[PDB]
Design an enzyme around this catalytic site. Structure first.
Site, PDB file in Angstrom:
ATOM      1  N   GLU A 125       0.476  -0.745  -0.185  1.00 36.86           N
ATOM      2  CA  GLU A 125      -0.159   0.095   0.417  1.00 36.86           C
ATOM      3  C   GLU A 125       1.092   1.646  -0.096  1.00 36.86           C
ATOM      4  OE1 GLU A 125      -3.188   0.279  -0.697  1.00 36.86           O
ATOM      5  OE2 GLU A 125      -3.630  -1.344  -0.721  1.00 36.86           O
ATOM      6  N   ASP A 139      -6.386   8.582  -0.462  1.00 35.92           N
ATOM      7  CA  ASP A 139      -5.778   7.546   0.785  1.00 35.92           C
ATOM      8  C   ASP A 139      -4.881   8.019   1.393  1.00 35.92           C
ATOM      9  OD1 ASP A 139      -7.373   5.868  -0.981  1.00 35.92           O
ATOM     10  OD2 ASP A 139      -5.982   5.950  -2.116  1.00 35.92           O
ATOM     11  N   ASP A 193     -11.193  11.074  -7.942  1.00 36.59           N
ATOM     12  CA  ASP A 193     -13.076  10.719  -7.137  1.00 36.59           C
ATOM     13  C   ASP A 193     -13.089  11.565  -6.217  1.00 36.59           C
ATOM     14  OD1 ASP A 193     -11.833   9.162  -5.248  1.00 36.59           O
ATOM     15  OD2 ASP A 193     -13.416   7.693  -5.820  1.00 36.59           O
ATOM     16  N   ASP A 200     -16.560  -3.387  10.814  1.00 35.01           N
ATOM     17  CA  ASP A 200     -17.582  -3.071   9.366  1.00 35.01           C
ATOM     18  C   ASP A 200     -17.929  -4.358   8.711  1.00 35.01           C
ATOM     19  OD1 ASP A 200     -18.974  -1.601  10.958  1.00 35.01           O
ATOM     20  OD2 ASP A 200     -18.295   0.611  10.267  1.00 35.01           O
ATOM     21  N   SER A 222     -11.404  11.791  -3.212  1.00 37.65           N
ATOM     22  CA  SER A 222     -10.560  10.729  -2.073  1.00 37.65           C
ATOM     23  C   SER A 222      -9.595  10.652  -2.102  1.00 37.65           C
ATOM     24  CB  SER A 222     -11.821   9.281  -2.217  1.00 37.65           C
ATOM     25  OG  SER A 222     -11.192   9.261  -2.680  1.00 37.65           O
ATOM     26  N   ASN A 275      -7.444  11.187  -5.709  1.00 38.33           N
ATOM     27  CA  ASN A 275      -7.863   9.982  -6.379  1.00 38.33           C
ATOM     28  C   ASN A 275      -8.701  10.710  -7.634  1.00 38.33           C
ATOM     29  OD1 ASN A 275      -7.186   7.464  -5.491  1.00 38.33           O
ATOM     30  ND2 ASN A 275      -8.302   7.907  -3.725  1.00 38.33           N
TER      31      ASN A 275
END
Ligand code: NA
Length: 129
Positions: A35, A52, A48, A101, A50, A46
Protein backbone atom coordinates in the site's frame (compact mmCIF):
# COMPACT_ATOMS: atom_id res chain seq x y z
CA UNK A 1 8.62 7.89 8.91
CA UNK A 2 9.56 4.95 6.74
CA UNK A 3 9.41 1.82 8.85
CA UNK A 4 11.53 -1.22 8.61
CA UNK A 5 9.73 -4.52 8.10
CA UNK A 6 10.56 -6.00 11.49
CA UNK A 7 10.06 -2.73 13.34
CA UNK A 8 6.57 -2.40 11.82
CA UNK A 9 5.79 -6.04 12.62
CA UNK A 10 6.66 -5.45 16.28
CA UNK A 11 4.61 -2.28 16.44
CA UNK A 12 1.62 -4.02 14.86
CA UNK A 13 1.98 -6.97 17.28
CA UNK A 14 2.01 -4.56 20.24
CA UNK A 15 -1.22 -3.11 18.91
CA UNK A 16 -2.98 -6.45 18.74
CA UNK A 17 -3.07 -7.19 15.01
CA UNK A 18 -1.65 -10.67 15.08
CA UNK A 19 -4.61 -12.95 14.43
CA UNK A 20 -7.10 -10.06 14.53
CA UNK A 21 -10.22 -11.52 12.98
CA UNK A 22 -8.16 -14.44 11.78
CA UNK A 23 -5.51 -12.49 9.88
CA UNK A 24 -1.96 -13.32 10.89
CA UNK A 25 0.59 -10.60 11.43
CA UNK A 26 2.31 -11.16 8.10
CA UNK A 27 -0.86 -10.20 6.25
CA UNK A 28 -0.84 -6.77 7.85
CA UNK A 29 2.86 -6.21 7.21
CA UNK A 30 2.43 -7.31 3.57
CA UNK A 31 -0.53 -4.98 3.14
CA UNK A 32 1.46 -2.03 4.44
CA UNK A 33 4.44 -2.87 2.20
CA UNK A 34 2.40 -2.80 -0.98
CA UNK A 35 0.00 0.00 0.00
CA UNK A 36 2.56 2.55 1.16
CA UNK A 37 6.04 1.04 1.07
CA UNK A 38 5.99 1.45 4.87
CA UNK A 39 5.75 5.24 4.62
CA UNK A 40 3.53 6.85 7.24
CA UNK A 41 3.21 10.02 5.17
CA UNK A 42 1.99 8.37 1.97
CA UNK A 43 -0.98 10.07 0.29
CA UNK A 44 -2.73 9.15 -2.96
CA UNK A 45 -5.12 11.80 -4.27
CA UNK A 46 -7.80 10.19 -6.45
CA UNK A 47 -9.84 11.70 -9.29
CA UNK A 48 -13.07 10.91 -7.49
CA UNK A 49 -12.33 13.55 -4.87
CA UNK A 50 -11.18 11.08 -2.24
CA UNK A 51 -7.67 10.58 -0.87
CA UNK A 52 -5.94 7.53 0.57
CA UNK A 53 -3.95 8.27 3.71
CA UNK A 54 -1.03 6.80 5.54
CA UNK A 55 0.70 3.50 5.98
CA UNK A 56 -2.45 1.49 5.18
CA UNK A 57 -3.82 3.92 2.56
CA UNK A 58 -7.20 4.36 4.24
CA UNK A 59 -9.71 6.19 2.05
CA UNK A 60 -11.49 9.40 2.92
CA UNK A 61 -14.93 8.53 1.47
CA UNK A 62 -15.88 5.94 4.08
CA UNK A 63 -13.31 5.97 6.86
CA UNK A 64 -11.84 9.35 7.90
CA UNK A 65 -12.84 12.97 7.49
CA UNK A 66 -10.72 15.32 5.37
CA UNK A 67 -13.47 17.88 4.73
CA UNK A 68 -13.04 17.70 0.97
CA UNK A 69 -14.49 14.33 0.01
CA UNK A 70 -18.05 13.93 -1.30
CA UNK A 71 -20.20 11.33 0.49
CA UNK A 72 -18.08 11.20 3.61
CA UNK A 73 -19.15 8.67 6.25
CA UNK A 74 -16.22 9.05 8.65
CA UNK A 75 -16.76 5.58 10.08
CA UNK A 76 -13.47 5.61 12.03
CA UNK A 77 -14.51 8.94 13.59
CA UNK A 78 -11.17 10.62 13.00
CA UNK A 79 -9.63 13.36 10.91
CA UNK A 80 -7.64 11.86 8.07
CA UNK A 81 -4.57 13.80 9.25
CA UNK A 82 -4.41 11.48 12.28
CA UNK A 83 -3.53 8.71 9.78
CA UNK A 84 -0.35 10.59 8.75
CA UNK A 85 1.32 10.36 12.17
CA UNK A 86 4.64 8.61 12.84
CA UNK A 87 2.87 6.57 15.50
CA UNK A 88 0.64 3.91 13.89
CA UNK A 89 -2.05 3.78 16.54
CA UNK A 90 -4.79 5.68 14.65
CA UNK A 91 -4.16 3.69 11.47
CA UNK A 92 -4.31 0.42 13.37
CA UNK A 93 -7.49 1.40 15.21
CA UNK A 94 -9.16 2.36 11.96
CA UNK A 95 -7.95 -0.78 10.20
CA UNK A 96 -9.55 -2.85 12.97
CA UNK A 97 -12.83 -0.96 12.33
CA UNK A 98 -12.60 -1.61 8.60
CA UNK A 99 -12.55 -5.31 9.26
CA UNK A 100 -15.20 -5.11 11.99
CA UNK A 101 -17.56 -3.26 9.58
CA UNK A 102 -17.99 -6.46 7.69
CA UNK A 103 -14.99 -6.24 5.35
CA UNK A 104 -12.17 -8.64 5.32
CA UNK A 105 -8.72 -7.68 4.16
CA UNK A 106 -10.09 -7.55 0.64
CA UNK A 107 -10.75 -3.89 1.51
CA UNK A 108 -7.07 -3.31 0.65
CA UNK A 109 -6.51 -3.73 -3.09
CA UNK A 110 -2.81 -4.32 -2.56
CA UNK A 111 -3.54 -7.13 -0.11
CA UNK A 112 -5.87 -8.86 -2.53
CA UNK A 113 -3.51 -8.49 -5.49
CA UNK A 114 -0.11 -8.91 -3.88
CA UNK A 115 -0.49 -10.72 -0.55
CA UNK A 116 -3.48 -13.10 -0.87
CA UNK A 117 -2.35 -16.63 -1.65
CA UNK A 118 1.33 -15.84 -0.93
CA UNK A 119 3.59 -16.95 1.90
CA UNK A 120 2.88 -13.93 4.07
CA UNK A 121 4.93 -15.36 6.92
CA UNK A 122 7.92 -14.32 4.92
CA UNK A 123 7.16 -10.76 5.98
CA UNK A 124 7.83 -11.50 9.64
CA UNK A 125 10.51 -14.17 9.23
CA UNK A 126 13.71 -13.35 11.05
CA UNK A 127 12.13 -10.62 13.17
CA UNK A 128 12.30 -10.15 16.96
CA UNK A 129 8.71 -10.00 17.86
NA1 NA B 1 6.20 3.50 1.33
Amino acid sequence: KVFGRCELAAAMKRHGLDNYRGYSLGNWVCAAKFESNFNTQATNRNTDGSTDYGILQINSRWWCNDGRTPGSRNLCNIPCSALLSSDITASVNCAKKIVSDGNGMNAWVAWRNRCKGTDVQAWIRGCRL
